[PDB]
Structure 1
Amino acid sequence: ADGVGSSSGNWHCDSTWLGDRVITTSTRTWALPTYNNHLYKQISNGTSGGSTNDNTYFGYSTPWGYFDFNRFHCHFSPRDWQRLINNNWGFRPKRLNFKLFNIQVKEVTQNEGTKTIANNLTSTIQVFTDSEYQLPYVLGSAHQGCLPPFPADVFMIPQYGYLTLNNGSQAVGRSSFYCLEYFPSQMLRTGNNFEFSYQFEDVPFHSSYAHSQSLDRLMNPLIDQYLYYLSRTQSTGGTAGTQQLLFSQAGPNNMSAQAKNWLPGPCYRQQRVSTTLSQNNNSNFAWTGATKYHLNGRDSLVNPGVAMATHKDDEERFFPSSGVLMFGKQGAGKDNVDYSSVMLTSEEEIKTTNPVATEQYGVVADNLQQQNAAPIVGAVNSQGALPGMVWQNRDVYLQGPIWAKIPHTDGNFHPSPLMGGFGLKHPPPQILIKNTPVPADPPTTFSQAKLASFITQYSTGQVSVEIEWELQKENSKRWNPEIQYTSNYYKSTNVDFAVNTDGTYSEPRPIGTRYLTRNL
């Protein structure tokens, strides 16, 4: 039986590779403080201050914290991630299991300048999952506070808050307020533990691979087509330019002119930025020249956007302004940090099926020609979905988000998250946790006012999350060797994906998921 002298659970970290399943499991140590002195608070920012109209919000910050495991490096070691991306075409999550155990609640008190900390054995914490998704779902925005990548780290649990409809800083009539104490929650003392199990809905495998064929090269290089195209509108070789309609079969000589069954994926253009500083314009175009969308009078930057190739062949240095996911190196500031600190992801692999982010989708005619009027062709900067169009989703990264919640709406088009991930209508429920408030001594004469004086308190414990993953094994007749993800062979001051002299775990580079090839 449970008690103060027996542990509620054991430490488990593994990856079990069996057949087409891999079961990854993680355990971390967390510390949950008291947020907002146990208060709900209205929070808002209006345009009255230096804030612009785009940055206005209205919402509430709660006392509650929440667990976020939504990043891959929570569930995978760099070596486990290497087994995955080298040997497999696809993977999808199946089920997860989640546990809290070994909970300590501790009171801390100040006397003059000295601090002291003592166990409080009778205190509780409150934990519930929102199984029914009745709360604003705050996961999937790529917020900080996930379990650390490295298992020996102890992390602080992030505070829960949410945003609601606003006009300026003020709230409208449809604005909702949620009291989290109004759900049923389990209360745990130091001998109690918490568990639940969740099963993922059927979701398509993330495709981890690149195409070994571009979309326009699917043809046989040897053979002509029986179809014809319009090769020349004018008389050739004549002393007069008299117009004449001449047709030709497209063939190995002109492939660009052949008939084709499919079209590249949709395009929404990004502004191109060069890593070489001299090539860029001299100005600040970051916000002004940015690609934005306009929703209810507020312009929101489009980030990262629809999945589009970062750059074309033999341009390494150019990247779309908002187009790529950008990760920071260990110990990087939050504000105006130099380029050397960020790690730019790149989509190389989707150049085959997807247009380049920084270039036009194509060119269409602007006019009806006449013998008098010359033909005019305009560029297509943004192109929605057309029939016969194929595309790839953005690639997941070891540092990136696993899933997002598909908004509940009448309709959606290809509901896959633009940060990359698995779109889920019923994602893993978000787990909320709070220290139960313990009052400081009340007065001896009754007063109606609520008690504003509490014992300063925090809790720690252990958390285990276990996800079963389904694998799609690579089966390929390719003769020559694949590209693999490999560590650098040459010597270095310190090992990649390992602690340094000071004990700081760092991740050198973002690791994409597609090294394998398939036929398009």
Structure 2
Amino acid sequence: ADGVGSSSGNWHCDSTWLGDRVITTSTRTWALPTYNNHLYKQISNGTSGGSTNDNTYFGYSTPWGYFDFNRFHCHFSPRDWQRLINNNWGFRPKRLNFKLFNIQVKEVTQNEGTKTIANNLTSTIQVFTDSEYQLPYVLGSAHQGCLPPFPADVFMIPQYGYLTLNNGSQAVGRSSFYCLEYFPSQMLRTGNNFEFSYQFEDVPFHSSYAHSQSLDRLMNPLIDQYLYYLSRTQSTGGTAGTQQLLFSQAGPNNMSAQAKNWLPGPCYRQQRVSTTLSQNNNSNFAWTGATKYHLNGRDSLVNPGVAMATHKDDEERFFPSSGVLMFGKQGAGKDNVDYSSVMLTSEEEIKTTNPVATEQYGVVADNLQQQNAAPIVGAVNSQGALPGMVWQNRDVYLQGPIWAKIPHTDGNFHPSPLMGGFGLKHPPPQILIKNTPVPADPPTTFSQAKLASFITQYSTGQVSVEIEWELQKENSKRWNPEIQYTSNYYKSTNVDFAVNTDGTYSEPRPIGTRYLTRNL
């Protein structure tokens, strides 16, 4: 059986492409510190400080840590991603499998200036998975702390905390406080290992492709319609303008006037920003000119927002202020970092079905005309969903979030995450882990107070997560060649998606999933 001298598992990273299933397994090495000196702590931010009313919060920061595998590049190598996005229309997860193994718990002490570290063989850790969804589910907010993209990186496990209802910095009566030690957990020593399995609930395949037809152009270019439209309301060419109702059949000449069975997806406008600096207005409109939503007296910037085409044809320089997912390049600052450091994603492929983010949805009439009163047409900046309306969801990326938890609520509309992903009602249960506190020597005379002196301690180990995927094979009679994701053919100082001289891994650009085409 297991013991201090026999390893708890084996390293696995691999991808098994079998028919329609691709099974991706991965493994990393982690280190879990001691957070908050084994304490839960109230954390809050009020408007009495320098903070504003939108930035207030109230919540708790627990000593527990948690594993987050929720980004795609955790599970896919750039070459396995290329096989996926080039050769397949859609993919969805089926089941996953998860393991902790090879647990090394280490005590570390300080004598003057020297440091020394040593195994503690009797120490434990605590691991439970929240499979009844009874805790604040904090995954899916696109926080840092995921497994690294690159299998040779060692990563620090992030601290678990949660937010609760507040009023200002103060808490209200509905505010919940959760004690994570109040669950059953599994205590593991260095010989022990951990495992669980999970099976995804049925979800629509992520549709990875671009339509080969725009929504308005579904017509036959050759044949006229038998339907009529109102072409001309005035007498044409005569010495008088006497109004006369003239009708016409729309056809290849006027295709903007044809009747159509469907409408574009819903529009919620964004502000337009140009990459060229000279064009943008001179002021700071980033927050002020932003598109926000007002909930309970707190203005919240709308990010990334509803899926909407980034820009129209032959304008690549304009992008919606809050609209696009923005990834930073390797080694980029957290605050006020210049444009060249971030990587702006763009949705070109949904221009067909979805309206441009920075432009109006359309035009409606504002008034009832009269012989005296001219007709007036207003702009529709924000448009909810109407019957006969189709749209595309936002695209997933190699760097972006895999799924999200659909909040438990009375109703939702198209419960698909706005960052892109797979909306799940019962998402993969978040896994929590902590170093079991080991006390320093108590006094020899009894004391009621809790023990405030602990041994400085941390643990390390190996974690493996294996997700089975369901692929939708591309079956198409298109004659000409597709567009594929290909690496740059020309020479470069170093390979892309590979280490540099110093060993720093880097991902040069965001890679979306839609290179294939279908008919709209």
TM-score range, shorter chain: over 0.9
**2:25 & 2:293 partners in 1: Cα distance?**
39
* Structure 1 ranges of 4+ moved more than 3 A: none
**1:327 & 1:76 partners in 2: Cα distance?**
18
Per-residue CA deviation, residues 33-63 of structure 1 (Å, 9 max, x unaligned), is 0000000000000000110000000000000
TM-score (norm 2): 1.00
Per-residue CA deviation, residues 473-518 of structure 1 (Å, 9 max, x unaligned), is 0000000000000000000000000000000000000000000000
Cα shift at 1:363: 0.2
What is the DSSP-based 3-state SS (H/G/I as helix, E as strand, rest coil) of the residue aligned with 1:82? Answer: helix
Cα shift at 1:288: 0.1
Cα shift at 1:376: 0.1
What is the DSSP-based 3-state SS (H/G/I as helix, E as strand, rest coil) of the residue aligned with 1:353? Answer: coil
Per-residue CA deviation, residues 255-301 of structure 1 (Å, 9 max, x unaligned), is 00000000000000000000000000000000000000000000000
**1:390 & 1:288 partners in 2: Cα distance?**
32
Per-residue CA deviation, residues 131-169 of structure 1 (Å, 9 max, x unaligned), is 000000000000000000000000000000000000000
Per-residue CA deviation, residues 2-34 of structure 1 (Å, 9 max, x unaligned), is 000000000000000001000000000000000
What is the DSSP-based 3-state SS (H/G/I as helix, E as strand, rest coil) of the residue aligned with 1:217? Answer: coil
Cα shift at 1:404: 0.1
Per-residue CA deviation, residues 439-462 of structure 1 (Å, 9 max, x unaligned), is 000000000000000000000000
**2:510 & 2:23 partners in 1: Cα distance?**
23
What is the DSSP-based 3-state SS (H/G/I as helix, E as strand, rest coil) of the residue aligned with 1:116? Answer: strand
Per-residue CA deviation, residues 73-102 of structure 1 (Å, 9 max, x unaligned), is 000000000000000000000000000000
**1:305 & 1:44 partners in 2: Cα distance?**
27
Per-residue CA deviation, residues 369-418 of structure 1 (Å, 9 max, x unaligned), is 00000000000000000000000000000000000000000000000000
What is the DSSP-based 3-state SS (H/G/I as helix, E as strand, rest coil) of the residue aligned with 2:66? Answer: strand
Cα shift at 1:230: 0.2
Per-residue CA deviation, residues 172-207 of structure 1 (Å, 9 max, x unaligned), is 000000000000000000000000000000000000
Cα shift at 1:349: 0.2
**2:254 & 2:94 partners in 1: Cα distance?**
48
What is the DSSP-based 3-state SS (H/G/I as helix, E as strand, rest coil) of the residue aligned with 2:44? Answer: strand
- Which residue in 1 is equivalent to 2:437? 437
**1:268 & 1:154 partners in 2: Cα distance?**
41
**1:237 & 1:277 partners in 2: Cα distance?**
48
Q: Any stretches of 5+ residues in structure 1 without a counterpart?
A: none
**1:173 & 1:476 partners in 2: Cα distance?**
58
- Which residue in 2 is equivalent to 1:108? 108
**2:483 & 2:500 partners in 1: Cα distance?**
29
**2:379 & 2:309 partners in 1: Cα distance?**
18
Per-residue CA deviation, residues 99-120 of structure 1 (Å, 9 max, x unaligned), is 0000000000000000000000
Q: Any stretches of 5+ residues in structure 2 without a counterpart?
A: none
**2:398 & 2:81 partners in 1: Cα distance?**
7
What is the DSSP-based 3-state SS (H/G/I as helix, E as strand, rest coil) of the residue aligned with 2:216? Answer: helix
Cα shift at 1:332: 0.2
What is the DSSP-based 3-state SS (H/G/I as helix, E as strand, rest coil) of the residue aligned with 1:216? Answer: coil
What is the DSSP-based 3-state SS (H/G/I as helix, E as strand, rest coil) of the residue aligned with 2:339? Answer: coil
- Which residue in 2 is equivalent to 1:65? 65
Alignment length (residue pairs): 520
What is the DSSP-based 3-state SS (H/G/I as helix, E as strand, rest coil) of the residue aligned with 2:257? Answer: coil
Cα shift at 1:232: 0.2
Cα shift at 1:222: 0.1
**1:237 & 1:77 partners in 2: Cα distance?**
67
What is the DSSP-based 3-state SS (H/G/I as helix, E as strand, rest coil) of the residue aligned with 2:374? Answer: coil
Cα shift at 1:366: 0.2
**1:375 & 1:250 partners in 2: Cα distance?**
23
**2:26 & 2:59 partners in 1: Cα distance?**
33
Cα shift at 1:437: 0.1
Instruction: Using the aligned pairs only, state the percent identity.
Output: 100
TM-score (norm 1): 1.00
Pairing 1:299–2:329 present: no
What is the DSSP-based 3-state SS (H/G/I as helix, E as strand, rest coil) of the residue aligned with 1:65? Answer: strand
**2:25 & 2:508 partners in 1: Cα distance?**
23
**2:159 & 2:227 partners in 1: Cα distance?**
64
**1:334 & 1:13 partners in 2: Cα distance?**
31
Cα shift at 1:325: 0.2
Per-residue CA deviation, residues 211-245 of structure 1 (Å, 9 max, x unaligned), is 00000000000000000000000001110000000
- Which residue in 2 is equivalent to 1:424? 424
What is the DSSP-based 3-state SS (H/G/I as helix, E as strand, rest coil) of the residue aligned with 1:10? Answer: coil
What is the DSSP-based 3-state SS (H/G/I as helix, E as strand, rest coil) of the residue aligned with 2:340? Answer: coil
**1:356 & 1:262 partners in 2: Cα distance?**
17
What is the DSSP-based 3-state SS (H/G/I as helix, E as strand, rest coil) of the residue aligned with 1:148? Answer: coil
- Which residue in 1 is equivalent to 2:213? 213
- Which residue in 2 is equivalent to 1:134? 134
Cα shift at 1:324: 0.3
**2:316 & 2:430 partners in 1: Cα distance?**
40
What is the DSSP-based 3-state SS (H/G/I as helix, E as strand, rest coil) of the residue aligned with 2:263? Answer: coil
What is the DSSP-based 3-state SS (H/G/I as helix, E as strand, rest coil) of the residue aligned with 1:62? Answer: strand
- Which residue in 1 is equivalent to 2:174? 174
**2:286 & 2:44 partners in 1: Cα distance?**
26
**1:172 & 1:329 partners in 2: Cα distance?**
41
What is the DSSP-based 3-state SS (H/G/I as helix, E as strand, rest coil) of the residue aligned with 2:347? Answer: coil
**2:449 & 2:334 partners in 1: Cα distance?**
41
What is the DSSP-based 3-state SS (H/G/I as helix, E as strand, rest coil) of the residue aligned with 1:117? Answer: strand
**2:284 & 2:435 partners in 1: Cα distance?**
46
Cα shift at 1:71: 0.1
Per-residue CA deviation, residues 305-336 of structure 1 (Å, 9 max, x unaligned), is 00000000000000000000000000000000
**1:315 & 1:413 partners in 2: Cα distance?**
32
- Which residue in 1 is equivalent to 2:9? 9
**1:212 & 1:35 partners in 2: Cα distance?**
52
**2:128 & 2:300 partners in 1: Cα distance?**
34
What is the DSSP-based 3-state SS (H/G/I as helix, E as strand, rest coil) of the residue aligned with 1:163? Answer: strand
**1:133 & 1:36 partners in 2: Cα distance?**
25
**1:16 & 1:226 partners in 2: Cα distance?**
54
What is the DSSP-based 3-state SS (H/G/I as helix, E as strand, rest coil) of the residue aligned with 1:73? Answer: helix
- Which residue in 2 is equivalent to 1:408? 408
